[PDB]
Design a protein around this ligand. Structure first.
Ligand SMILES: OC[C@H]1O[C@@H](O[C@@H]2[C@@H](O)[C@H](O)O[C@H](CO)[C@H]2O)[C@H](O)[C@@H](O)[C@@H]1O
Ligand code: CL
Ligand code: CL
Length: 138
């Protein structure tokens, strides 16, 4: 077994979500993160050529980053309180894809097993992102 799970990072508010079904669409190719003054408000992830159903709320500005062909996320750091505040996706092309404000409890997620990358995310959401979990696999 090469799969592993990092999380949950955040608190117990909101309703659980998962992108487990989405990995069949392909590898992660892009990220959308809605952000305001204090929080990560929403999240969307592009699996192959297909975006996940948007999760989170509407009170923030949408930020979007596309990954390069064959670029994978190999480390995720961030910060949270009762809600998620910052995320940094570190790639195997040496890019640090940062979203949100530098404040709160820090976390640092890396994969357990050899040669695995970020395949999908899960977590909790409502009007904001309450929590996030990272799922690693081949
Ligand atoms: O005390 C935790 C309670 O949190 C409630 O979820 C919140 C939503 O109602 C609101 O719209 O968004 C925020 C931020 O995303 C959520 O935390 C849950 O509905 C309750 O079940 C829970 O008791
Ligand atoms: Cl950058
Ligand atoms: Cl940390």
């Amino acid at each position: 077994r090469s799969s592993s799970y990092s999380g949950e990072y955040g608190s117990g508010g909101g309703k659980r979500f998962s992108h487990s079904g989405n990995q069949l669409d392909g590898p992660i190719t892009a990220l959308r993160v809605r952000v305001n003054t204090y929080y990560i408000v929403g999240l969307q992830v592009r699996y192959g050529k297909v975006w996940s159903d948007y999760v989170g709320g509407r009170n923030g500005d949408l930020e979007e980053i596309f990954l390069h062909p064959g670029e994978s996320v190999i480390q995720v750091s961030g910060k949270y309180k009762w809600y998620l505040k910052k995320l940094v996706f570190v790639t195997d092309k040496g890019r640090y894809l940062s979203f949100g404000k530098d404040s709160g409890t820090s976390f640092n997620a890396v994969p357990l097993h050899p040669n695995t990358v970020l395949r999908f995310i899960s977590g909790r959401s409502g009007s904001l992102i309450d929590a996030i979990g990272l799922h690693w696999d081949v």
